[PDB]
Symmetry: C2
Subunit: 392 residues, 2 copies
């Protein structure tokens, strides 16, 4: 290891360790925000993934949570990986994942990075512009391209798709298939069905001009926590049919997905410390915690997260709540975590909990104002590690 | 040095080095975005600050551009520094800046960082909440407090200020003075006058209860480029009066300010490379460059910047422009730099320039999606270095 990985004893859960670690610090000082990353919770998710989409190989979107522990755990399990930069590819390879288990999914790759990928055995890439294709002919002509269709920054339409395939023929580049991305703000499950239906169409378009296409990549956008309206399995209910319909297994197709938030969202809890307080007329409170929209909560901007503040201190049986807002630690007037919420009067020194903080949080945090990335404590149960061995 | 500092030869300017460096990398590519930081431009600014506000000592807001070369250059000049975290204080001190030249301006400090500041000789801090005071009593009782007033996350109103001074008396904490912060979205110069007027009032309020206050801190929010409507000196036109009126120098007051964007905004140009391109019906273009809203351009979100794309390639004498948008390099659909603009048809390999990119750009950049922080080339002219000596 080059990471703080600890084994949970018999009856201990992740949240118990969190509860423990905040307690075993209350002497002295230094009540810096920290994560508890339950690697078990990631296994659970992989396993559950195998159950739900048993046709669909998952290729973890590294971008989502780039942490070495997450990728090493996942690697051990036998997931594929979705990399979008040379540096993502290097990470994965430096954990001994072979290239066959990587898809360079970024549709607009800087040429030197295409070059990097080519000098390292990464054959499968994604595209959706004619220019992209010209790049690939120059930099990686043996590459296996996946055409990325629309469902906006990325996604070729069907008219372009026809023109791309032709332009890819005159170029002698192999198009092994089609990829779409639904997006996390996915309300309708129908969207999947529609997109699979369009992909089946491009597969047909593609055979018409002699492409022997064998790959369907269904993107990501699967939820990572139970605390959403449209649940994971509900989505897989309308996919398996649509897949069996347009992509029956006797057609020798191979189906993959790019899940990110799905694996890691719930796996991480964030304990931040109330470090200052203001009373406004004792009617409403403003609390200042030591992580902001420039740190872990950057997601309330970039990823459109809604965060729910949880009390680490088990609440009293009826206690009088007040209108409270939570703020980040920076000199930025706009660094505000919760605009309005309902809370017991709390105190400087009290810790707040933030559940489901794995996805698109630490990965896009910057140390603006000089504030440090919170320290991450990896934990894994006895059972969990057994299960990670079976996958080896 | 631990930074790439180069001396411009006779007729070379910063922009000439940029023009030079992009030309010296046209063969075997690797066209990564890079900054050209003219440290001479920084000097110019300090010199011009001395002329404009000759009463006011400038305390650079480290937060804004924490680069080691920027700090060291400024330190060498004799500016003070505005730190908001332990880590900002450390940086400054690690460059030999004595603590008398530091103001811990963050009004809501985490107790351990107060403690750090206290064990390191940093006596001047800022506050605006009764809880803040309680903290200071416990952690740094000898501290010199600056009360930060309102002009919202920070700023005690005049009612609060009366109550704070009282509560600071019963606590035996010294309040040496007042600070306000106008903000960069400052349209009216009047706001300064108003705020100085309020600060004069708090000085009076404070003497009423026997505070011997000697410090006025006027914040920052001064513009860093000529390319704004309300210009630097114009603002100093309405300040020098206001100051001489409410804070005449025979009153032995000491006046400081916390400029950030003022010193550095214009000093940095960013060269990004167009790495992909799409054509939509050849009518409108989408260009993809290799820096985004997760990197340098994070400011278009956090700092509310509007960026003007410049052609590195001197334009043809009439050339046909098209509606173009510029995008960052991440898989984030929302990663968009310019939503719409007017540009010659340009190519994968062409570089675009972004002027005035010093402030609140690199300092809040994260390496999301695995994309690297652009490399920074520091440069300083013969003249410039001469002038940095005089200040020593």
């Amino acid at each position: 290891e080059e990471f703080d990985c600890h084994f949970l004893d018999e009856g201990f859960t992740a949240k118990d360790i969190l509860d423990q670690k905040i307690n075993e610090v209350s002497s002295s000082d230094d009540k810096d925000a920290f994560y508890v990353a339950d690697l078990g919770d990631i296994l659970k998710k992989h396993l559950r993934w195998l159950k739900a989409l048993p046709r669909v190989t998952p290729f973890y979107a590294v971008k989502c949570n780039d942490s070495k522990a997450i990728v090493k755990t996942l690697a051990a399990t036998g997931t594929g990986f979705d990399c979008a930069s040379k540096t993502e590819i290097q990470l994965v390879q430096s954990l001994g994942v072979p290239p066959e288990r990587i898809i360079y999914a970024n549709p607009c790759k800087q040429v030197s990075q295409i070059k990097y990928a080519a000098n390292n055995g990464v054959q499968m890439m994604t595209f959706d512009s004619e220019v992209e294709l010209m790049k690939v002919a120059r930099a990686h002509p043996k590459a296996k391209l996946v055409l990325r269709i629309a469902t906006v920054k990325f996604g070729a339409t069907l008219r372009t798709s026809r023109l791309l395939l032709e332009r890819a023929k005159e170029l002698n580049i192999d198009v092994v298939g089609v990829s779409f991305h639904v997006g996390s703000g996915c309300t309708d499950p129908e969207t999947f069905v529609q997109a699979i239906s369009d992909a089946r169409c491009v597969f047909d378009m593609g055979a018409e001009v002699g492409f022997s296409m064998y790959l369907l990549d269904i993107g990501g956008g699967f939820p990572g926590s139970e605390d959403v309206k449209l649940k994971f399995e509900e989505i897989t209910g309308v996919i398996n049919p649509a897949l069996d319909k347009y992509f029956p297994s006797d057609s020798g197709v191979r189906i993959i997905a790019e899940p990110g938030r799905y694996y890691v969202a719930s796996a991480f809890t964030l304990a931040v410390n109330i470090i200052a307080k203001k009373i406004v007329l004792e009617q409403t409170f403003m609390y200042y915690v030591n992580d902001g929209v420039y740190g872990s909560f950057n997601c309330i901007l970039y990823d459109h997260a809604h965060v729910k503040p949880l009390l680490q201190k088990r609440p009293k049986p009826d206690e009088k709540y007040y209108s409270s807002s939570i703020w980040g630690p920076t000199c930025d007037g706009l660094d505000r975590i919760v605009e309005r919420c309902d809370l017991p009067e709390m105190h400087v020194g009290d810790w707040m909990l933030f559940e489901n903080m794995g996805a698109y949080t630490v990965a896009a945090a910057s140390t603006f104002n000089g504030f440090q990335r919170p320290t991450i404590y990896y934990v894994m149960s006895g059972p969990a590690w057994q299960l990670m061995q079976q996958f080896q």
